[PDB]
C-alpha cells in the first residue's frame, strides 16, 4: 500500500499541475495522501568564455539549468493509482512509481 510517486521536471508550473492532478486523483479515489514533499532544487551551472579566439576582453557566459524533484507517498493497492498515473501526461515532467 505504502507506494512512492516521485516527479522530476526542469519546468516548475508543469510539475505543480502534475502534483495537483495526483492529489485530485488520490482524494477522489478515497486513499491516504502524503502531500508533495519538495526536495531542494539542483542548479547545474556551467561557465565558459564567450569568444572562440582569445583576442577580446575576458567576458564569461553563466549558463544555469534548474532541476526540481517532488514526491507524494500514498496508501493504495498498485492498480487504482497505476490507472490514475496512466492519464494526463505532458512532455516536461518525468514519472517514477516505487512500490517498496
Amino acid at each position: 500500500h505504502r507506494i512512492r510517486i516521485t516527479l522530476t521536471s526542469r519546468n516548475v508550473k508543469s510539475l505543480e499541475k502534475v502534483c495537483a492532478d495526483l492529489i485530485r486523483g488520490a482524494k477522489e479515489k478515497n486513499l491516504k495522501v502524503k502531500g508533495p514533499v519538495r526536495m531542494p532544487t539542483k542548479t547545474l551551472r556551467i561557465t565558459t568564455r564567450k569568444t572562440p579566439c582569445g583576442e577580446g576582453s575576458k567576458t564569461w557566459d553563466r549558463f544555469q539549468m534548474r532541476i526540481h524533484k517532488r514526491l507524494i507517498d500514498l496508501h493504495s493497492p498498485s492498480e487504482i493509482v497505476k490507472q490514475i498515473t496512466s492519464i494526463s501526461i505532458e512532455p516536461g515532467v518525468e514519472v517514477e512509481v516505487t512500490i517498496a
Binding site: K42, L44, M65, I67, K69
Partner: peptide, 19 residues
C-alpha cells in the same frame, strides 16, 4: 534501470539527445 545514473547526468543526456 540497474545502470542507475544521476538525475543531473540523465537530464544533460536527454538534452544532447534532442540536440
Amino acid at each position: 534501470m540497474a545502470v542507475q545514473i544521476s538525475k543531473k547526468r540523465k537530464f544533460v543526456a536527454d538534452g544532447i539527445f534532442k540536440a
